């Protein structure tokens, strides 16, 4: 499972993001190398934060594998970032034209 | 892409120190390595860097909020 | 004509590379051209030819804007920049000692990556 | 003439940013422009542990009301701890009994596959570094400010945010819109706008 | 009547007995003292004063104290003249708005200009932010050493409208003024919680199911306070909390007296055995009201049927039910004698700041 | 009459002979390696069958 | 309009200002509106039941907020889980839904005619913490103050605690059977917490291993999956469908659960690493069985 | 496509038939509601109070789904219950007609 989600992870998806145009691409801002780290992370980017977790019951509301998270991490940039979409559509003859 | 400017979890702003905090890890880095190129540097197995001293010296609590958001953040300009 | 040659040759990345190192320079204003007359100048400076001048002749990888500094390619990172734009517009119009030069340069640019990856 | 124009159709608000109208390899022009959106971790994005413990995020707690520590400490994520026992994801937990003493001593260390590990060695460092035996400690309800009877194990794990938005999978369309030609049904799916 | 003992005020200073940190200091910043504005650390003891009270000051600092942000106006970002890629105005905008200010005037206007001449990755720091509005700055309300975003070889980055904007920390979190950093009861014995027998226990030898703790000691955290005023400014701090609690207190006491004209935020009930239900209504308002109103009504009336508040996350709103064996204006005048001791605690508390901190 | 995909990356790759810091002013990542082809502004992976 | 037997946008009806008898207006749901709520895959007949509609006016909220006892009805988690919605329009669709497909009729499964909903990890486990008989501390006992805050938030009507002196200690039993005096049953069965593969090594409470409810009043053991978990056959929910009702089972899920809830909200819960840590005597032990083990398995390989 | 074949093997206006009625001695189904058979009562009653408006009860109410639920409850509902189970090929309907204000009215609750 987690061979799949590291890899599903959003994170710096392109080093280049600037100069491309890529359909459903997000690009997390902010990225930590693990407390724990491992042998992979000398040749990845790691992807996601060292965010502070309490495994403890807090109103139910974290029931059947939910996570109940900080409404300031989110504020202060805790796995934000940017989703890019891309529109494209070209003429089908000259008989066609932009305006 | 950045240390972030207050720590992630408690908002105490660690943000104030990173600068200053890159430069002298930098150079606390420098002393503490020996024969080992810097791609190799998480992979020393006889290699022990603490900044506990470092980060206390900069004023920041002991908190493991803090100190873990500022020891670990990647810096864009490092990679890019 | 200037129309279709406007588009793809503001879209190249070779462009964007001469225009950015124009604007290190400072011959080439920061901004992004904000009115037709400026965009004018900002191809002359980057290509070496107004748009009609490329359509007319057939060489057009040379006159290219270089670096108006001519670092001293023997801070550090500012020669590196350069030194790397030039053997760009060197490949692009096929310098005679390309390969070699590129080869010395590929050995300066690892040691630098290096103690750029110590920063890191 | 006639109308062919593109409606931006999504109900999420965007940002326009691209100018650019390249030349095709049919040699012809074409539009590609770039949408912006602006994400933060809403209301039912996924997020998960390098062990492989999925989760929606639902609560949006203010600062206020998280649970805190005697010392301050407030997590991010508040993880149930029931998610651990049917999975038998201790990879997680001891990544957070590691990384609290690695925060403590301000260092990083290596946690690789197959590495030689002894946790009760590890629990020893932590209380060397000043912290319990275990992770846990004393923490207090952020909204009562009342004091939990059992101490609380609280650390900093690695998270995850898995990229299945909540912005982009949630769909619903009112009683009318695009049909299909053939059987008068609704057109298939949230892309072609109906069904 | 001293609720509010002595304070302990402790800033955050940086240490350059160190040689890494006096070097790099010196070496980008220019840095040998310590900085205009310092994260100060307060640890605060509170004695004959209920829990609630207590944890509601505690809130009311970390979040619900309307303070300041900078922001950037609606068209600041200048898109055109901003030739950085990899700068978005949402980053930008994310790392300005959580630079801790401490700011006395709110028409300072600030602006970033800041363009790359030069072929190396510039790094913009927070000296770079040059203001251009309102009285001249006689001392910077933030440090000069905050990272914003760097910029890339031969790109600019122009922001020209950075302004101050107010705002309370529950709605957006780069209003949060404190940080906690210690909450414990000193009334209540502790256990040696290194030992085996305790460690999986929160260490206090009583219930909190059974504990009443009358006697604590509050530590907070401010992020940025001018260096030559620490006191003053915690004293503003701590003195305009009690006044948001004593004003939220008297918002709820003005509906409370109006026992009649039946407004859609006070319904009472009188059902079954001449007993008495009051439910209470009010919208965007938290725990520390609910707690605080549910604590000092239990105070005023041990024998009570029933008291109690939910603030569920949904609907946004504190809904207190109190239920009674007395008439509709008996169970008034009694809920009206707890929100007046209410705030003739918190006046004690201001006053008492006033007495020890100075 | 033929033009042949170039897997980027490959030494019939214009980045081949470009530097890190070229690479990066021209809009490729300098520190992805490459091995895939770009047809119709796409990009794709070649697996191993 | 009926008069001209079209539809109309408001955005132009501000000349009208009025409708009359014979027109149809399509209103946006409002709380209360009964709603179907389905998931794929649908193999059960409670994969479409009718809920009430809890319209959150939070605009950042774009999920579908349920219970997590409701989980059970859709075989749900909230690992990523989609679920369809949509909400009846006609009368005829409303009144069959209300009245039909209400998910009160899906509290007895029609495959095994057992109860599916209940107290499901956090609300089992709570009701364990709240009911049994010794905290670490002592007697599992609180104050007015904390008996009163276990029912703020069942949304019932709460009872009567003007008997209670503000120092007197009310049991947890005590509070629980408060909250089942609004359905008595009878109930009689050993709980889960007991299990004879414990019982030689921890000792347990006398007054734990027996669960007894007469008439509502739980007097005795404690409360886990066995009485009040989800699925449990004979457990105290399918009582109170049975005598009562299915709608009254799905009220009293929800009390106890909140019950439960707010006494870990104030006892507190976790799991920890030296949780799962054995001692070096018992590793030592676990060596010597797994030794054995391999013992006589090489005995096997030696014949 | 290929059918996997295991082929296995096996006056357009049909008479009109009288509705015969069973006596009310004679009716054999339970005279109480089906669960189905009360909701379909008070969902036609509640459209047709949706379309006509006019009601029987001396109290207000402003939804016609509590009308007509109501109008179940306090039996005076205008519909009959036809329970018919038989088509004979001599083109005869065989049902039953139930007065719902006389059957017992299920929980619905
Ligand atoms: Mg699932
Ligand atoms: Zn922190």
């Given amino acids: 499972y987690e061979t799949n989600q590291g890899r599903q992870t959003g994170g710096w998806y392109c080093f280049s993001w600037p100069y491309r145009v890529d359909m459903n691409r997000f690009f997390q801002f902010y990225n930590e190398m693990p407390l724990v780290k491992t042998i992979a992370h000398n040749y990845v980017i790691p992807n996601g934060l060292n965010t502070i977790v309490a495994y403890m019951i807090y109103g139910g509301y974290n029931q059947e594998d939910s996570v109940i998270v900080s409404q300031s991490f989110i504020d202060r940039g805790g796995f934000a970032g940017t989703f890019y979409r891309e529109e494209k559509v070209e003429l089908e003859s000259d008989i066609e034209s932009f305006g | 892409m950045l240390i972030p400017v207050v720590c992630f979890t408690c908002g105490f702003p660690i943000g104030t120190y990173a600068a200053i905090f890159d430069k002298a890890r930098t150079e606390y880095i420098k002393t503490k390595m020996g024969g080992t190129l810097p791609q190799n540097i998480p992979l020393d197995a006889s290699l022990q860097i603490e900044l506990k001293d470092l980060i206390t010296a900069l004023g920041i609590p002991m908190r493991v909020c803090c100190r873990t958001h500022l020891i670990t953040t990647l810096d864009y300009r490092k990679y890019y | 004509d200037t129309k279709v040659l406007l588009t793809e040759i503001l879209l190249d990345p070779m462009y964007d590379y001469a225009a950015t190192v124009a604007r290190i320079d400072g011959s080439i204003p920061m901004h992004k051209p904000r009115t037709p007359k400026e965009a004018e100048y900002e191809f002359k400076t980057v290509i070496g030819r107004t748009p009609a001048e490329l359509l007319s002749q057939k060489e057009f990888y040379d006159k290219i804007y270089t670096s108006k500094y001519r670092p001293d390619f023997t801070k550090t990172s500012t020669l590196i920049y350069l030194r790397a734009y030039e053997l760009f517009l060197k490949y692009l119009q096929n310098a005679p000692n390309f390969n070699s030069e590129l080869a010395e340069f590929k050995t300066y640019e690892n040691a630098y990556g290096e103690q750029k990856a110590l920063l890191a | 003439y006639i109308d062919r124009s593109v409606m931006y159709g999504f109900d999420e608000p965007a940002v326009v940013d691209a100018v650019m109208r390249p030349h095709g390899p049919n040699d012809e022009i074409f539009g590609l422009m770039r949408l912006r959106y602006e994400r933060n971790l809403n209301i039912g994005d996924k997020m998960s542990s390098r062990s492989g413990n999925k989760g929606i995020a639902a609560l949006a707690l203010p600062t206020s009301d998280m649970p805190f520590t005697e010392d301050g400490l407030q997590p991010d994520l508040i993880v149930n701890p029931h998610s651990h026992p049917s999975r038998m994801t201790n990879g997680q937990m001891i990544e957070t009994t590691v990384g609290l003493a690695n925060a403590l001593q301000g260092v990083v260390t290596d946690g690789t596959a197959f590495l030689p590990i002894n946790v009760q060695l590890l629990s020893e460092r932590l209380a060397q570094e000043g912290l319990r035996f275990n992770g846990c400690q004393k923490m207090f309800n952020g909204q009562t400010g009342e004091y939990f009877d059992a101490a609380i194990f609280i650390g900093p794990t690695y998270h995850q945010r898995l990229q299945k938005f909540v912005l982009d999978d949630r769909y619903a369309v009112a009683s009318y819109g695009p049909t299909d030609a053939l059987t008068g049904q609704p057109l298939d799916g949230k892309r072609s706008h109906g069904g | 009547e001293k609720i509010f003992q002595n304070v302990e005020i402790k800033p955050f200073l940086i240490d350059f007995s160190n040689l890494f940190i006096k070097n790099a200091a010196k070496k980008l910043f220019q840095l040998e003292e310590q900085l205009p504005l310092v994260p100060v650390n307060v640890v605060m003891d509170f004695k004959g004063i209920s829990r609630a009270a207590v944890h509601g000051l505690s809130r009311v600092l970390q979040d619900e104290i309307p303070n300041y942000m900078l922001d950037i106006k609606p068209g600041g970002y200048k898109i055109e003249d901003s030739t950085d890629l990899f700068m978005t105005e949402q980053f930008i905008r994310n790392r300005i708005n959580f630079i801790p200010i401490y700011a006395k005037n709110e028409t300072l206007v600030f602006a970033l200009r800041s363009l790359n001449n030069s072929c190396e990755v510039k790094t913009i720091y927070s000296r770079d932010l040059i203001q251009v509005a309102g009285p001249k700055l006689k001392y910077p309300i933030f440090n000069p050493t905050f990272e914003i975003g760097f910029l890339q070889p031969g790109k600019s980055l122009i922001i020209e409208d950075i302004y101050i904007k107010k705002g309370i920390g529950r709605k957006h979190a780069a209003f949060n003024l404190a940080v906690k950093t210690h909450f414990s009861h000193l009334d209540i014995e502790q256990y040696p919680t290194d030992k085996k027998e305790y460690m999986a226990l929160s260490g206090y030898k009583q219930s909190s199911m059974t504990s009443d703790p009358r006697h604590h000691r509050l530590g907070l955290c401010f992020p940025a306070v001018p260096l030559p005023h620490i006191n003053q400014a915690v004293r503003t701090y701590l003195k305009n909390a009690c006044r948001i609690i004593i004003g939220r207190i008297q918002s709820i006491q003005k509906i409370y007296e109006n026992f009649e004209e039946p407004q859609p935020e006070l319904v009472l009930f009188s059902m079954d055995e001449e007993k008495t239900k009051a439910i209470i209504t009010i919208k965007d308002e938290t725990h520390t009201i609910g707690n605080l109103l549910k604590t000092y009504i239990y105070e005023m009336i041990p024998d009570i049927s029933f008291v109690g508040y939910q603030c569920v996350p949904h609907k946004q709103e504190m809904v207190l039910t109190i239920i009674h064996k007395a008439s509709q204006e008996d169970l008034i005048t009694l809920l009206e004698k707890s929100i007046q001791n209410i705030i003739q605690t918190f006046q004690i508390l201001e006053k008492n700041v006033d007495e020890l901190i100075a | 009459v033929s033009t042949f995909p170039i897997m980027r990356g490959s030494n019939r790759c214009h980045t081949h002979h470009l530097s890190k810091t070229a690479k990066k002013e021209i809009g490729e990542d300098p520190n992805e390696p490459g091995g895939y082809f770009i047809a119709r502004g796409g990009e794709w992976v070649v697996d191993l069958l | ?303 | 496509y290929v059918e996997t074949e295991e082929e296995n093997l096996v006056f357009v206006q049909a008479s009109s038939q009288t509705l015969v009625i069973i006596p009310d001695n004679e009716r054999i189904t339970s005279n109480v509601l089906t669960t189905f058979e009360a909701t379909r009562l008070v969902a036609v009653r509640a459209q047709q109070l949706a379309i006509n408006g006019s009601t029987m009860l001396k109290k207000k109410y402003s939804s016609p789904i509590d009308i007509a639920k109501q109008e179940l409850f306090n039996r005076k509902i205008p519909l009959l219950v036809m329970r018919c189970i038989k088509v004979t090929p001599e083109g005869q309907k065989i049902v039953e007609i139930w007065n719902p204000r006389e059957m017992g009215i299920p929980l619905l609750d």
Avoid at chain 7, 16 to 27: A, K, P, Q, S, W
Avoid at chain 7, 188 to 207: C, D, F, G, I, L
Avoid at chain 7, 230 to 254: N, V
């Fill in chain 7, 1 to 303: 309009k009926q008069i001209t037997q079209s539809v109309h946008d408001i955005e132009g009806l501000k000349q009208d200002f009025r409708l009359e008898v014979g027109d149809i207006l399509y209103r946006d749901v409002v709380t209360g509106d009964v709603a179907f709520f389905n998931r794929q895959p649908s193999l059960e007949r409670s994969s479409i039941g009718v809920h009430r509609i809890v319209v959150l006016e939070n605009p950042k909220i774009s999920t579908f907020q349920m219970n997590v006892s409701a989980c059970a009805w859709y075989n749900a988690d909230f690992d990523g889980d989609q679920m369809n919605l949509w909400v009846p329009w006609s009368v005829m669709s409303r009144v069959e839904a209300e009245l039909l497909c209400s998910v009160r009729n899906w509290f007895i499964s029609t495959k095994s005619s057992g109860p599916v909903n209940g107290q499901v990890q956090d609300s089992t486990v709570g009701s364990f913490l709240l009911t049994r008989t010794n905290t670490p501390m002592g007697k599992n006992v609180m104050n007015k103050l904390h008996a009163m805050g276990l029912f703020q938030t069942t949304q019932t009507d709460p009872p009567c605690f003007a008997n209670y002196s503000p120092t007197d200690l009310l049991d947890g039993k005590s509070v629980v059977s408060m909250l089942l005096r609004q359905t008595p049953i009878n109930y009689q069965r050993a709980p889960t917490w007991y299990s004879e593969v414990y019982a030689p090594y921890m000792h347990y409470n006398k007054q734990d291993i027996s669960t007894q409810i007469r008439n509502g009043e739980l007097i005795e053991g404690v409360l886990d999956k066995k009485a009040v978990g989800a699925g449990s056959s004979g457990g105290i929910y399918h009582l109170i469908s049975r005598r009562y009702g299915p709608q009254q089972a799905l009220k009293m899920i929800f009390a106890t659960q909140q019950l439960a809830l707010n006494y870990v909200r104030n006892a507190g819960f976790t799991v920890s690493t030296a949780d799962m840590l054995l001692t070096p005597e018992a590793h030592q032990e676990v060596q010597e069985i797994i030794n054995e083990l391999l013992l006589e398995s090489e005995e096997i390989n030696n014949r």
